[PDB]
Design an enzyme around this catalytic site. Sequence first.
Site, mmCIF file in Angstrom:
data_model
loop_
_atom_site.group_PDB
_atom_site.id
_atom_site.type_symbol
_atom_site.label_atom_id
_atom_site.label_comp_id
_atom_site.label_asym_id
_atom_site.label_seq_id
_atom_site.Cartn_x
_atom_site.Cartn_y
_atom_site.Cartn_z
ATOM 1 N N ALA A 1 -12.317 4.452 -4.726
ATOM 2 C CA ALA A 1 -13.558 5.123 -5.119
ATOM 3 C C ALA A 1 -13.311 6.552 -5.614
ATOM 4 O O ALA A 1 -13.906 6.986 -6.595
ATOM 5 C CB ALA A 1 -14.538 5.144 -3.946
ATOM 6 N N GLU B 1 -4.402 -7.067 -1.231
ATOM 7 C CA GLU B 1 -3.272 -6.650 -2.051
ATOM 8 C C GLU B 1 -2.557 -7.808 -2.735
ATOM 9 O O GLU B 1 -2.056 -8.696 -2.054
ATOM 10 C CB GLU B 1 -2.239 -5.875 -1.220
ATOM 11 C CG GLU B 1 -1.112 -5.312 -2.085
ATOM 12 C CD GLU B 1 -0.305 -4.211 -1.432
ATOM 13 O OE1 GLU B 1 -0.472 -3.948 -0.220
ATOM 14 O OE2 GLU B 1 0.522 -3.611 -2.150
ATOM 15 N N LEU C 1 5.654 0.165 -20.290
ATOM 16 C CA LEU C 1 6.626 -0.456 -19.391
ATOM 17 C C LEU C 1 6.582 0.281 -18.068
ATOM 18 O O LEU C 1 6.636 1.501 -18.047
ATOM 19 C CB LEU C 1 8.038 -0.366 -19.984
ATOM 20 C CG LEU C 1 9.224 -0.823 -19.124
ATOM 21 C CD1 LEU C 1 9.181 -2.304 -18.927
ATOM 22 C CD2 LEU C 1 10.541 -0.420 -19.785
ATOM 23 N N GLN D 1 -6.990 -4.000 1.744
ATOM 24 C CA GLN D 1 -6.749 -3.734 0.313
ATOM 25 C C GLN D 1 -6.683 -4.990 -0.587
ATOM 26 O O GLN D 1 -6.535 -4.868 -1.802
ATOM 27 C CB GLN D 1 -5.499 -2.871 0.127
ATOM 28 C CG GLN D 1 -5.437 -1.595 1.032
ATOM 29 C CD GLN D 1 -6.766 -0.854 1.144
ATOM 30 O OE1 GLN D 1 -7.390 -0.525 0.133
ATOM 31 N NE2 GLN D 1 -7.198 -0.588 2.374
ATOM 32 N N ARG E 1 -10.531 7.767 -6.883
ATOM 33 C CA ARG E 1 -9.491 7.840 -7.913
ATOM 34 C C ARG E 1 -10.090 7.871 -9.328
ATOM 35 O O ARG E 1 -10.936 7.047 -9.665
ATOM 36 C CB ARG E 1 -8.516 6.670 -7.754
ATOM 37 C CG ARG E 1 -7.755 6.671 -6.406
ATOM 38 C CD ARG E 1 -6.244 6.901 -6.533
ATOM 39 N NE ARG E 1 -5.469 6.444 -5.375
ATOM 40 C CZ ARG E 1 -4.136 6.358 -5.340
ATOM 41 N NH1 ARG E 1 -3.398 6.678 -6.405
ATOM 42 N NH2 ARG E 1 -3.529 5.946 -4.233
ATOM 43 N N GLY F 1 -6.140 1.618 -8.708
ATOM 44 C CA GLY F 1 -6.630 2.988 -8.818
ATOM 45 C C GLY F 1 -5.476 3.971 -8.979
ATOM 46 O O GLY F 1 -4.452 3.801 -8.340
ATOM 47 N N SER G 1 1.434 -2.570 -7.324
ATOM 48 C CA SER G 1 0.482 -2.952 -6.274
ATOM 49 C C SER G 1 -0.910 -2.970 -6.873
ATOM 50 O O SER G 1 -1.295 -2.035 -7.576
ATOM 51 C CB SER G 1 0.493 -1.926 -5.131
ATOM 52 O OG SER G 1 1.802 -1.741 -4.607
#
Length: 207
Positions: free
Chosen positions: A141, A171, A125, A169, A143, A86, A131
């Site tokens: 939500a 991640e 680039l 998250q 974003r 996001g 992340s």
Amino acid sequence: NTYQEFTNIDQAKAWGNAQYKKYGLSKSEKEAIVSYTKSASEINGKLRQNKGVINGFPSNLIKQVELLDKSFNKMKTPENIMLFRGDDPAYLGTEFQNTLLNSNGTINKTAFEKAKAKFLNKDRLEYGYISTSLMNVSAFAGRPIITKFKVAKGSKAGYIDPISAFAGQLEMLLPRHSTYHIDDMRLSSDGKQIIITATMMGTAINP
């Protein structure tokens, strides 16, 4: 050809945890990763500001960056996978900061057209690390830009969630200095977000 897209949090967690168990990260590598989750915007910010050149960084930061880069020798995805990110308007450029969003909260359609003209079917680039999450988690939500990265089997990518300082998250981290190609850009059903699909390619940093 096809990229696995997790549709269930517990399934994603289970798969991610199984990957993490196999990495065999060094103690120094784990420390560098924990620190990255607490200070990503600073690290990524300095990398962007200096176009990947770390020579002028403080000695502790050079060491942290080298440890993160080295960690991706142990962290690869075993299959084609879809990752999610996001972003706020400044991701598209300074010009979108105050123009992307209408007063009501929808994507301004003229700003959208400028963004596709700028990015669609082009390479990009990224100097910082990227992340991502295994799913479109609730944290983004609010974003306005959702990116979906198609990451190929064998690519550098690690499930760092178990040692993140922050919860929930799912991640997955990708290497710095990575290039991706934006394949498609469209509005979400309710018009509040830009959905970007991108194919992840390589990074120029292979320690």
